[PDB]
Design a protein around this ligand. Structure first.
Ligand SMILES: O=C(O)c1ccc(-c2ccc(OCCCCCCOc3ccc(Nc4ccccc4C(=O)O)cc3)cc2)cc1
Lengths: 113, 115, 115, 113
């Protein structure tokens, strides 16, 4: 599990559940190629995206479908999505945490061995 | 302004208006002595708390009354308030801005310190 | 100013100065068309990106070049940049401020929207 | 485990390890009485602070010794500490997460069953 994404709701003080997350890798032609995706769990976490063998060095984009999240709660959101773009370098485990509000998002990386 | 507070509302995407702020200074005796107070304006800013002469060295507490803010809006939040405690002016006079971002279950504060 | 960006540095407790910002608008064709660009001033603010007339309805991307900022300071950060994508002016003209707080391994953005 | 505290370093992208945390409960005379304390673990988490039986409704203060944390890293910090003050109400598990930078701290609550 070199990559885990966790999503939090700052309005309700809870995990953000059933949030779609899409991971892309940057290809040599600068396009974004699908890499991994899923929906956050009841704990707001998304496990099992990738394996060490697949997760090579490069530039990755994590897109979080925050607009659907908010609209399903009957709340009009500001952003079209939340995006986090980063280079993976060879400590080895990346946790991407995002904290969501209708008009704000924050993202932090915790990178450990 | 040697001491300013600015507050944003991350739910409404607006300044956080009419937020009460109480400032305290730790006294000789190690209690919190009231120092100044005010509330944020339509721009979410609070100016005119103090003066260069009055804002001497010390340990200051900026209490941001986030609970009353969310409750005045008829919303039930997590925290009682936001407290920001720092030593000020120990290397000569500086200008301090306390910036805060509020959500019902989260807040954040950052300090901008200028000479 | 219909569109403004302000950026703070949570490490130094200062405005984030000389941060490059590129704005894009999604085009007819579904690509990102360059729209405007600038860099933050000594106050960490970026004014004069656009005009009311030019800032029509659309989907806008504000790219904040945080990597170049941390690297110009000789520091190695996590993110490539900060991207902020939103639909603007779909209910008539508004004024948008994109506020960001930066640390090497974390950033945060909030929008203040006024009428 | 009705109360867990987690502390993150936004400068290094890591758990904030060996950070002292003190919990107090507000007494009827408005003083703060010691309640629980410890140091964050290698994951930046502090488990086992209290039990359901001890953790009654009331106002609690969590104080995080951020100044020592920064100074031990050779960094001059802005705040004297980070503090989080909240009322416990009868969902039942509170996670207090704090993200630290020299001149900033953020705190979020995740409150689940
Ligand atoms: O258990 C876990 O795995 C876990 C759970 C939760 C975790 C966290 C913890 C903390 C997190 O995020 C908070 C984020 C960063 C700080 C806050 C937000 O942003 C701003 C704050 C203040 C701002 N003010 C400002 C800036 C410039 C100009 C003007 C202003 C103003 O007027 O207020 C602007 C933006 C996210 C996730 C981490 C780990």
């Amino acid at each position: 599990c070199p990559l885990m994404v966790k999503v939090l709701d700052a309005v309700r003080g809870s995990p953000a559940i059933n949030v779609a997350v899409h991971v892309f890798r940057k290809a040599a032609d600068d396009t974004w190629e699908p890499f991994a995706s899923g929906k956050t769990s009841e704990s707001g976490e998304l496990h099992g995206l990738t394996t060490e063998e697949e997760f090579v060095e490069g530039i990755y984009k994590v897109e979080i479908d925050t607009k659907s999240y908010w609209k399903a709660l009957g709340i009009s959101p500001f952003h079209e999505h939340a995006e986090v773009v980063f280079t993976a370098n060879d400590p080895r485990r990346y946790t991407i945490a995002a904290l969501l509000s209708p008009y704000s998002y924050s993202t932090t990386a915790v990178v450990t061995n």
